[PDB]
Amino acid sequence: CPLMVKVLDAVRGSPAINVAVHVFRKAADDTWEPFASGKTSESGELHGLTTEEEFVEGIYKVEIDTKSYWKALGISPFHEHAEVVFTANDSGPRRYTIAALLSPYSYSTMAVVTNP
Amino acid sequence: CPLMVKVLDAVRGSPAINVAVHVFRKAADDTWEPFASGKTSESGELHGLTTEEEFVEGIYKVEIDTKSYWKALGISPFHEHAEVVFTANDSGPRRYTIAALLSPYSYSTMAVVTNP
Amino acid sequence: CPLMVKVLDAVRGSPAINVAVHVFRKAADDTWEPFASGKTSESGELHGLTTEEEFVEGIYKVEIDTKSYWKALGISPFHEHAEVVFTANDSGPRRYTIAALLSPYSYSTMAVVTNP
Amino acid sequence: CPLMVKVLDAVRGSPAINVAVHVFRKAADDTWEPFASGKTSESGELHGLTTEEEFVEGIYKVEIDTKSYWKALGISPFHEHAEVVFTANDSGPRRYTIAALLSPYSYSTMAVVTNP
Structure with missing residues (x-):
């Protein structure tokens, strides 16, 4: 579990x-070399990446495919994806949880x- | 205008x-004694409070009627309202803008x- | 666990x-009648309320004492507290997680x- | 001005x-081909892009150099930059404001x- 991603939907709670x-x-x-991928579970979480x-150590990009999520709910969202870019492990190994809170025209991470 | 309120809708952008x-x-x-009130303009702003x-100087509360906003769009919301509570401090000249970004199950201010 | 509160610090990660x-x-x-209170643990979570x-069923207010948190870190924040007001259980029992992400001049919930 | 960018600092308000x-x-x-660039003004805004x-119509990326911003304040940040990726759509007349609210370990857009 050095890298976990959690995604929440602010429209549905x-x-x-x-x-x-x-x-x-x-x-x-x-x-950008492919590193890992997956899909969030029923908890909104993606473990085991x-x-x-x-x-x-390196510069990592986590790309969350928000457009496809919204579209399947009937919403035409603004963003293509949410991208989170960060240096990791540069002072030794750490555990990272990347969380995203999604709305059709807004996200936070x-x-x-x-x-x- | 030492106090301005801006409200944005993250579902519709x-x-x-x-x-x-x-x-x-x-x-x-x-x-809490009533101090000022109004309705946001076409730009989502409320000036002239x-x-x-x-x-x-004192403690103020800004209450934003989010529930009625969502109900008018036919969207079921979580919160009764959004509340922003803060101290006004004289510390040289100052202007306060209180922004709120609204989603049905989330807000940020x-x-x-x-x-x- | 019908009510859990989670609080995160956006300055420190x-x-x-x-x-x-x-x-x-x-x-x-x-x-507003007192209902329950507590403090977040080392995980940022408050269970057992x-x-x-x-x-x-009822209208509940969760008041998160953000000012006191910031002040003990050496920061002079804007808000007195973060307040989350909501109707609960009005379509039967539900489980609620109230999350807050804190910055000195901003929060989201x-x-x-x-x-x- | 069909495109404006606004950047706010949630640590200092x-x-x-x-x-x-x-x-x-x-x-x-x-x-990704370079399209426009600039530096935010005293109001946090960048006009005239x-x-x-x-x-x-097309897919655009707005990259905001958050890391350099925090480094100049002496604050250690998480992200390399903040990226906003979206499709511009002709759908009657339209103006886009991309806002970003920055904290060291978090942003919202x-x-x-x-x-x-």
Whole structure:
């Protein structure tokens, strides 16, 4: 559990279920290499993306596919996706929870970072 | 205009128009006394609530009638209203903008305090 | 667990620990009667406030004592407290998670409502 | 002015001044091509990015240099930058305001889309 993503739906007051999430890591040649992906569960949470060993220092991008979520609810949202870009593990291994609260024309995102 | 209120609708990506706003000031006996009120304009803003002379240091509450706003859109909301409670402090010249971003099950509020 | 409160600190990227929370329920004479209170744990969470039996239909106010939290960190925040006011259980018993994300001049609050 | 960006600082309750903002438009080959850029004004706003003629339908990215903003205040931030990605749609006349509310470990963004 060094990386967990949680997504909530501010319209329904619920977890955002079946939201696709793609994680990327910046490579040596400055491109975004695919790192891990998954979908949020019935709790709005996505666990198991990576391991402590694999989640090395680097610049990571978490891309939450909000448009597809809204569209399947009948809403035409503003954003294509929510993107969260951050340096990880640069002072040693940490645990990151990336949370997103979604509305059709707005989101917020928060990171909780803990040292195990 | 030392106090302005702005209300935005995160479902429709618009100003929140015709929202009732009530301002109170905490009295000596610790009750909330009516101070100012109005309805947001087409821009989601409510100007002209008070004056520099009248807006003395004290504890204020801004109550925003969110429930009625959502009910008029046919959307079931969580909150009865949104409440913003703060102390006004003389600390050189100051203007307060209270912003609220509304979703059915969530709101965020921000205060922007500036000196012209 | 019909009522849980979670508080996060957007400055530190952490749970907001030792935050006082007071819950009130609107009485028959339209006053706010004390209902329950507590403090957030090391996880930022406050569990055990009430029981399914005691948490009847009504209008509830959750008052999160944000000012005192900030002040003990050396920050002079804007708000006195964050207040969350809502009708509960009016279509039968539900479980409510009230979350707050705190910054010195801003907060957001979200409710997750589930039917057990 | 079909596109305006506003950036606010939730730690200090102020406009976020002198923040670099870069706008990109998605090209045919799926890369992000520079489109407009500037730095926020004393009001936290960036006006004059584009024109109605130039701002055709397409996918845009607004990148806000949050990290440099926080570093200048001596505050350690989580994100590399804040990114807002959206489709511009002709649907009668329209003006887009992209707002971002910044905290060290969190941001929220809102789009206000209006027709004069």
